Amino acid sequence: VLLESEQFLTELTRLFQKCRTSGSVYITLKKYDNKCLLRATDGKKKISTVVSSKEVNKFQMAYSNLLRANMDGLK
Amino acid sequence: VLLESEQFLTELTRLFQKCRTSGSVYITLKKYDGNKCLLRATDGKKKISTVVSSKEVNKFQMAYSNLLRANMDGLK
Amino acid sequence: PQYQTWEEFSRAAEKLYLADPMKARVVLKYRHSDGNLCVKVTDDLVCLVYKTDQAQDVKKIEKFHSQLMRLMVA
Amino acid sequence: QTWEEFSRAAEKLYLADPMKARVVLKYRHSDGNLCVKVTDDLVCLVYKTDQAQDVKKIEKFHSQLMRLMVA
RNA sequence: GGGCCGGGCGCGGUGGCGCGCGCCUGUAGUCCCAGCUACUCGGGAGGCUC
């Protein structure tokens, strides 16, 4: 079941937040069939969405910010 | 850009002043026709040139010579 | 195979995706508690893998994604 | 010598064909160094300096070459 | 209506384009502005030439 582009990004932000303490986030990207499917899960809970040319712009920047700010633990 | 005798000198002074911290000030001289010579100056960003004729060479060279000598004091 | 520099793995990965923009898939796994990232690109027969714990990389990746996301949508 | 010789070669090119050659002059205040070059795109004759006593002659060689172009 | 008003190497920027910094180097023959919003595709003003 697909989620609206925006909603997707909120659930995702949430996954990361829940997995900080101790867990893992998985995000996968594949051509949908022009669109591309995007899925993410923490092991149990699973979220997905489809991003098109109609929406790549608003989405990339948002998605970009999400990944950058939430992957902090590294050296 | 092609300037008039004067103009060129003031723009040129700047090129040196706008490069005292870094960058290179180029100047190429050349015999020109299509008697006159083509004078060009560039800092890499802004370009400027002028056309010097036998009619003004003395008056122009007077200031141009002081200009080059004063702005180029920075070597060993 | 796994790679030691983002440079290689990048084209390696991009090229691989290119030779079949339909089977290929890219997954990412971040574990905050261990402080490491891990990108892998598969074909379910071929598998490329990059592992890191250098923050200097998160951007290189968020980019890669943003890059792959462009092909998939043109 | 080097400078005295150099000028000769240059004034040789200017005369050989004063319509195909040109003369560049690169001043790099920071690194602190001057550089004169006279070419004909078939003969790269170039002279670099960093010492201060060398500006005067380089500038004169410039002013002159100009005069032969306007004479 | 179409072509052109500079080229080269390195670093930086952006999904990408325009773009920023450093160095090198041309012609008789370039200026201004930040923009475009999935796009090998931002906008204005001059000049040259079919």
Sorted by where each starts, the structural domains of chain C and their CATH numbers stand as 1-74 (3.30.720.10)
Rounded to whole angstroms, the Cα distance separating D44 from B68 reads: 24
D69 neighbors B30 (Cβ within 8 angstroms): yes
Q: Give the residue among A39, A42, A61, A41 at the shortest CA–CA distance from A50.
A: A39
Q: Do chains A and D touch (3 or more CB pairs under 8 A)?
A: no
Q: Do B29 and D71 touch (CB under 8 A)?
A: no
Resolution in A: 3.2
* Way the structure was solved: X-ray
Cβ-Cβ contacts under 8 Å for D47 (sequence gap 6 or more): D2, D3, D6, D35, D36, D37, D58
User: What tokens were used for A46?
Assistant: 């699973």
Tell me the C-alpha distance between A31 and C35, whole Å: 30
CATH code, domain with A22: 3.30.720.10
Domain of B74, in residue numbers: 1-76
Query: Any chain C CB within 8 A of the CB of A62?
Result: no
Q: Is B57 on the interface with D (CB under 8 A)?
A: yes
CA pair distance C21, C17, nearest whole angstrom: 5
Alpha helices in A1-75 (DSSP H): 5-19, 56-70
Of C33, C62, C72, the CB nearest to A36: C72
The tally of domains found in chain A comes to: 1
Please give the Cα distance from B19 to B8 (Å, whole number): 17
